[PDB]
């Protein structure tokens with residue numbers, strides 16, 4: 001089986017979500033040693049912003065910049081469709097996801113490729129996947145009205161076919177050492193229950 | 198009084214939200230001729246993505262790139278604080294706002310500048326504003342679970358102090374000519390009720 005890990009924090013080795021993604025990988029390698037794991041760091045190797053020129057590349061001959069972004073989109077969709085387990089690190093910045101992750105989403109969502117229209121609605125074409133979202137927050141938003149990230153991720157992932165999503169939260173990072181420790185400990189325990197399922 | 202219009206679509210003169218923002222400006226000029234209106238097109242003049250280098254500029258001496266982004270952030274916050282009425286065009290792309298608008302948000306949200314921490318929580322420092330969100334959608338999401346854009350905008354704007362927000366929806370653009378006409382007509386009528394309040 002095949003695991004894809006998508007890192008999206010801008011805080012590099014200080015990132016809470018990267019430390020937790022790295023813990024997931026460690027645990028996965030020990031407990032499922034035959035599985036191949038690919039890590040894509042969307043901050044280290046940024047995906048361009050979706051602009052008018054790029055959306056044209058996805059939807060006459062293309063400019064160099066456009067051909068290249070189509071190629072990238074194809075590469076990213078191919079990689080997603082190639083993996084069985086999708087781990088998405090989704091730190092919350094200003095009540096949204098990171099722009100790093102977003103730009104990835106904007107190249108992956110493509111009609112007739114990752115979803116298609118039917119009579120009874122759109123349906124996703126990325127099938128058979130199990131996702132895990134590792135989402136870190138300075139504050140505490142879980143199950144509250146200020147967490148749009150969680151439902152947005154469920155919505156966006158479901159749209160492209162990924163309806164089996166498990167969320168791992170690391171909240172209250174900003175609230176001192178007991179709380180930041182609690183966040184790590186709680187997230188790791190959640191990861192452990194997933195890895196040993 | 199002073200009106201700031203923030204355009205965020207990537208579809209230029211084909212943009213539904215830009216056409217509706219332009220209608221708002223037209224109507225505002227006719228009905229409040231003394232008011233000064235500023236239009237900032239976040240697609241035409243893009244704001245950089247918030248990355249590790251830039252967040253450093255906001256939070257030792259800075260690189261050229263960092264000083265410049267601080268300067269930009271200061272300019273954007275100064276402009277926002279200078280206006281009374283804030284019109285934000287928020288087309289929905291892949292269940293989020295545009296990255297164009299987002300990058301603006303990521304430079305405007307700054308502790309001790311647009312919000313501050315207190316004992317009873319954070320409180321916004323952009324006070325006295327009236328916002329209008331003009332949000333366009335191919336589908337129909339209003340009051341449903343797939344509209345995270347609306348609560349995200351309320352949340353993010355409220356965080357920085359902008360708690361008086363009125364939403365103008367133009368939905369079902371993608372559903373043929375009666376529906377796209379309906380969207381325009383319904384949005385314009387909503388704008389009209391706002392402009393003549």
Ligand SMILES: Cc1cc2nc3c(=O)[nH]c(=O)nc-3n(C[C@H](O)[C@H](O)[C@H](O)COP(=O)(O)O)c2cc1C
Pocket residue numbers: 009010011014015016017018091092093094095096136137138139140173252
């Ligand atoms: C740009 C910026 C924006 C942030 N916005 C929020 C916020 O909306 N809500 C919150 O609870 N924490 C916020 N935080 C705190 C982060 O969510 C917290 O540091 C989390 O650990 C980030 O994950 P990371 O370390 O993997 O990048 C923000 C941090 C930064 C850098």
Ligand SMILES: Cc1cc2nc3c(=O)[nH]c(=O)nc-3n(C[C@H](O)[C@H](O)[C@H](O)COP(=O)(O)O)c2cc1C
Pocket residue numbers: 055206207208211212213214215288289290291292293333334335336337370
């Ligand atoms: C990149 C892309 C993504 C889109 N995503 C959605 C979507 O999530 N939901 C929806 O209802 N419409 C979606 N649409 C349709 C737009 O919301 C619709 O065309 C709206 O009119 C866009 O505003 P604009 O013309 O001002 O840019 C999308 C369009 C594009 C270009």
